[PDB]
Scaffold this active site. Structure first.
Site, PDB file in Angstrom:
ATOM      1  N   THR A 108       0.822  -1.206   0.000  1.00 13.26           N
ATOM      2  CA  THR A 108       0.000   0.000   0.000  1.00 13.26           C
ATOM      3  C   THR A 108       0.858   1.258   0.000  1.00 13.26           C
ATOM      4  O   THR A 108       0.586   2.206  -0.747  1.00 13.26           O
ATOM      5  CB  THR A 108      -0.927  -0.010   1.217  1.00 13.26           C
ATOM      6  OG1 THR A 108      -1.875  -1.076   1.088  1.00 13.26           O
ATOM      7  CG2 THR A 108      -1.669   1.314   1.347  1.00 13.26           C
ATOM      8  N   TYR A 135     -13.061  -4.327  -0.618  1.00  7.87           N
ATOM      9  CA  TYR A 135     -14.252  -3.937  -1.370  1.00  7.87           C
ATOM     10  C   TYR A 135     -15.330  -5.021  -1.426  1.00  7.87           C
ATOM     11  O   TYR A 135     -16.494  -4.740  -1.122  1.00  7.87           O
ATOM     12  CB  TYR A 135     -13.875  -3.504  -2.789  1.00  7.87           C
ATOM     13  CG  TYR A 135     -15.053  -3.040  -3.610  1.00  7.87           C
ATOM     14  CD1 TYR A 135     -15.672  -1.824  -3.346  1.00  7.87           C
ATOM     15  CD2 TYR A 135     -15.549  -3.817  -4.649  1.00  7.87           C
ATOM     16  CE1 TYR A 135     -16.751  -1.394  -4.098  1.00  7.87           C
ATOM     17  CE2 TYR A 135     -16.630  -3.397  -5.406  1.00  7.87           C
ATOM     18  CZ  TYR A 135     -17.226  -2.183  -5.125  1.00  7.87           C
ATOM     19  OH  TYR A 135     -18.299  -1.761  -5.876  1.00  7.87           O
ATOM     20  N   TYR A 166      -2.419  -9.794   6.491  1.00 12.94           N
ATOM     21  CA  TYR A 166      -2.454  -8.338   6.619  1.00 12.94           C
ATOM     22  C   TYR A 166      -3.904  -7.927   6.842  1.00 12.94           C
ATOM     23  O   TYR A 166      -4.735  -8.062   5.938  1.00 12.94           O
ATOM     24  CB  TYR A 166      -1.861  -7.660   5.380  1.00 12.94           C
ATOM     25  CG  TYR A 166      -1.854  -6.141   5.405  1.00 12.94           C
ATOM     26  CD1 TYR A 166      -2.077  -5.434   6.582  1.00 12.94           C
ATOM     27  CD2 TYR A 166      -1.615  -5.415   4.244  1.00 12.94           C
ATOM     28  CE1 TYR A 166      -2.075  -4.053   6.600  1.00 12.94           C
ATOM     29  CE2 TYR A 166      -1.607  -4.028   4.254  1.00 12.94           C
ATOM     30  CZ  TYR A 166      -1.836  -3.355   5.436  1.00 12.94           C
ATOM     31  OH  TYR A 166      -1.831  -1.978   5.456  1.00 12.94           O
ATOM     32  N   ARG A 219      -9.205   0.172   5.404  1.00 13.09           N
ATOM     33  CA  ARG A 219      -8.989   0.235   3.965  1.00 13.09           C
ATOM     34  C   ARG A 219      -9.771  -0.825   3.205  1.00 13.09           C
ATOM     35  O   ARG A 219     -10.310  -0.541   2.133  1.00 13.09           O
ATOM     36  CB  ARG A 219      -7.498   0.098   3.650  1.00 13.09           C
ATOM     37  CG  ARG A 219      -6.676   1.330   3.987  1.00 13.09           C
ATOM     38  CD  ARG A 219      -5.210   1.111   3.643  1.00 13.09           C
ATOM     39  NE  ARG A 219      -4.423   2.337   3.755  1.00 13.09           N
ATOM     40  CZ  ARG A 219      -4.315   3.250   2.793  1.00 13.09           C
ATOM     41  NH1 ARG A 219      -4.947   3.081   1.639  1.00 13.09           N
ATOM     42  NH2 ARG A 219      -3.575   4.333   2.983  1.00 13.09           N
ATOM     43  N   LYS A 273      -0.160  -8.951  10.040  1.00 12.88           N
ATOM     44  CA  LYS A 273       0.132  -7.538  10.159  1.00 12.88           C
ATOM     45  C   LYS A 273      -1.139  -6.840  10.633  1.00 12.88           C
ATOM     46  O   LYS A 273      -2.113  -6.750   9.691  1.00 12.88           O
ATOM     47  CB  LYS A 273       0.567  -6.879   8.838  1.00 12.88           C
ATOM     48  CG  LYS A 273       0.542  -5.365   8.831  1.00 12.88           C
ATOM     49  CD  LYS A 273       1.583  -4.816   7.880  1.00 12.88           C
ATOM     50  CE  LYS A 273       1.123  -3.438   7.398  1.00 12.88           C
ATOM     51  NZ  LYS A 273       1.927  -2.798   6.389  1.00 12.88           N
ATOM     52  N   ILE A 302       6.007  -3.450  10.310  1.00 12.20           N
ATOM     53  CA  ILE A 302       6.057  -3.123   8.889  1.00 12.20           C
ATOM     54  C   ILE A 302       5.679  -1.652   8.805  1.00 12.20           C
ATOM     55  O   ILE A 302       4.494  -1.296   8.843  1.00 12.20           O
ATOM     56  CB  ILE A 302       5.128  -4.003   8.046  1.00 12.20           C
ATOM     57  CG1 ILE A 302       5.585  -5.461   8.107  1.00 12.20           C
ATOM     58  CG2 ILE A 302       5.109  -3.530   6.600  1.00 12.20           C
ATOM     59  CD1 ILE A 302       4.696  -6.414   7.346  1.00 12.20           C
TER      60      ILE A 302
END
Ligand SMILES: [Mg+2]
Lengths: 296, 296
Positions: A45, A109, A135, A140, A164, A205
């Site tokens: 990202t 999404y 992750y 998001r 993550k 990260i």
């Protein structure tokens, strides 16, 4: 389980005249190696993976693998998708370009259910034989990988070794390590790097590490050595920049900071990403002045 | 401005043996036309656009365009992306395949700023000469198109004629139509079809319309004729099915309902989408019994 932990940097992808600046990408990764970074995360990202072509993402992974050859620094390549068939292909392609592991974001999404998340990640884990780090960033993706789903994936598939966590939910991080203390919890939220590490997390990260790799590296290694007083001291000092690096959506502030410090030649994004407002531009410039920024 | 309004259907995409059932797809679109639907939306989130190939997405648009030739029904093609270069390309390809307009979702996951959202849609609008309907669904994309950004785009770009609101925010719908009453507000939330239409919305892009196209059709046109007592009666009667169609993530319940009603022949999703839980399967089956479901 084979794992990739420690201080890791979500690398920005510098653009020059609309193309990926391969030199600066290579010169940026060598700067990370020189400041104690344990692993680099290409085409995530923070690397604007949404606007990179498959050819550009393949060049960035190849640049990352080649720059860290002959050193202990690993390459945890971003290889995620909201379509499982594509995420399998991205996983296979990252393994073939020499990546030591993949960071595969939860499907965005289309919001899969917990059952769908399990089958999604199970298909990825059985496609390659290299480590897979989950992750979870619900702000998001619109999706949340539950702790039960994370724990099941950790126990049922051998390549999946942790997650993550960029959720701002320290309660969930306690839930993870209290019920599955063998997993590798990785900080995906710079401001709370120390609290996550202090609970047993084994790495970060980071976005901040792009600008200040030496301080994020020192923070991670202080905490892993159980020197919580020095890890918290660096965490407290980074709070101002850790927050201001999100004045707008990542990687808009961090790329602006790299440009302000002269670490990249261009402040170019690919739409729909754009340069920040003059207001936030001045805020990033003013916050950077109180930190010692390493050069090349 | 050229507009596409009225009762519109976010088409599901039936799968059989992992392939797009083209015959069944065309027969579902003709079922919508025969039940008063004013426009069909191919390759939308309800059509599992994330897991379709570009060649498959082009087959669905061509089937929709070909089935709606010789009829009043327009084709509002899904043509959105979190990469502006791709969203521009998808816009150009949808119009070249005969689409009357495009439905462009707000960039997902990468969370552009309001400035970035403006340039994203401005670049799309100046790429084609067909109407462009904005799509704001923050629960899925992670970003919100502000009212000011929507109004600016509506007034500065001529292909942009309105927005498909799936926000659960009747306050924002008042905000939009009180400051810019010439835009076409489209309901993207079936349960609140009547409140949106009653405040000046000019249509819906419905999920329920897949199962009950006549009732969604009658609801919208009763409301457009200001027969609000009958529009609200259909909305009140549809509330149970409108909610149960989201017990799990769309389009899992609606595809489950279409299979239960025998309108599609196989209940196949593409990962990370999956069949619903057995409990929610029974719940969908139980709610369907109280509605008159039209056949072929
Ligand atoms: Mg849903």
């Amino acid at each position: 389980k084979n794992i990739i932990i420690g201080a890791m940097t979500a690398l920005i992808t510098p653009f020059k005249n609309g193309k990926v600046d391969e030199q600066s990408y290579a010169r940026l990764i060598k700067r990370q190696i020189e400041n104690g970074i344990d692993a680099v995360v290409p085409v995530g990202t923070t690397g604007e993976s949404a606007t990179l072509t498959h050819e550009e993402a393949r060049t960035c992974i190849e640049i990352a693998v080649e720059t860290c050859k002959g050193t202990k620094v690993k390459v945890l390549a971003g290889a995620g998708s909201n379509a499982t068939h594509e995420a399998v292909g991205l996983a296979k392609f990252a393994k073939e370009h020499g990546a030591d592991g993949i960071l595969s974001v939860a499907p965005y999404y289309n919001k899969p259910t917990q059952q769908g998340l399990y089958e999604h990640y199970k298909a990825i884990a059985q496609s390659v034989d290299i480590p897979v780090l989950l992750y979870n960033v619900p702000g998001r993706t619109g999706c949340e990988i539950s702790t039960d789903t994370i724990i099941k994936l950790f126990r049922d598939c051998e390549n999946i070794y942790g997650v993550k966590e960029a959720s701002g939910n320290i309660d969930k991080c306690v839930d993870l390590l209290a019920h599955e203390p063998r997993m590798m919890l990785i900080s995906g939220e710079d401001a709370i790097n120390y609290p996550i590490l202090s609970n047993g997390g084994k790495g970060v990260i980071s976005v901040t590490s792009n600008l200040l790799p030496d301080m994020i590296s020192a923070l991670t290694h202080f905490a892993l050595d159980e020197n919580y007083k020095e890890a918290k001291k660096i965490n407290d000092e980074l709070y101002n920049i850790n927050k201001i690096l999100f004045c707008e959506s990542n990687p808009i502030p961090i790329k602006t900071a790299m440009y302000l410090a002269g670490l990249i030649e261009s402040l170019e994004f690919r739409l729909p990403l754009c340069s920040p407002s003059k207001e936030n531009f001045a805020k990033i410039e003013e916050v950077m002045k109180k930190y010692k920024i390493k050069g090349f």
